Amino acid sequence: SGAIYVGNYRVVNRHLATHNDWANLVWEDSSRDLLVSSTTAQGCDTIARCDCQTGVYYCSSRRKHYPVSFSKPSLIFVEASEYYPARYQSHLMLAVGHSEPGDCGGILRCQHGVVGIVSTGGNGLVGFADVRDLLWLDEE
Ligand SMILES: [Zn+2]
């Protein structure tokens, strides 16, 4: 589990979104596994605005933050998981590392802020849903 709290936005994995998230929906995209809902309280996370390919992610199933290199956001074929069939997922970045379903929502961060959240795992790879192209999170 996990979210990003920026401004009056909460960013979560679409497959972990709550009723309250859908009841306060701003934007959602199944192909990216993302959903954004509106918040009453201001959040303090900063979204990275950059093309970094190195950062650090939180892996809840190891209680550890791991430094990783990660790929550029792309349309990636993902094997079936407990929460999606095998499919193409868009705006996804891969690293070599551990990720199980409970790790979804863990933050990937670089020197500029939050890059994205864990979304995929298996075959020794971890996949992150990028948020750096969602420039509207920074405003309004
Ligand atoms: Zn960066």
UniProtKB/Swiss-Prot annotation:
Coiled coil: none annotated. It catalyses: Selective cleavage of Tyr-|-Gly bond in the picornavirus polyprotein. Zn(2+) 1 binds at C50, C52, C110, H112. The active site is at H15, D33, C104. Homodimer. Cysteine protease that cleaves viral polyprotein and specific host proteins. It is responsible for the autocatalytic cleavage between the P1 and P2 regions, which is the first cleavage occurring in the polyprotein. Also cleaves the host translation initiation factor EIF4G1, in order to shut down the capped cellular mRNA translation. Inhibits the host nucleus-cytoplasm protein and RNA trafficking by cleaving host members of the nuclear pores. Counteracts stress granule formation probably by antagonizing its assembly or promoting its dissassembly. This is Protease 2A. It comes from Coxsackievirus A16 (strain G-10). The lineage of its organism: Viruses, Riboviria, Orthornavirae, Pisuviricota, Pisoniviricetes. The chain holds residues 869 to 1008 of 2193 of the full protein.
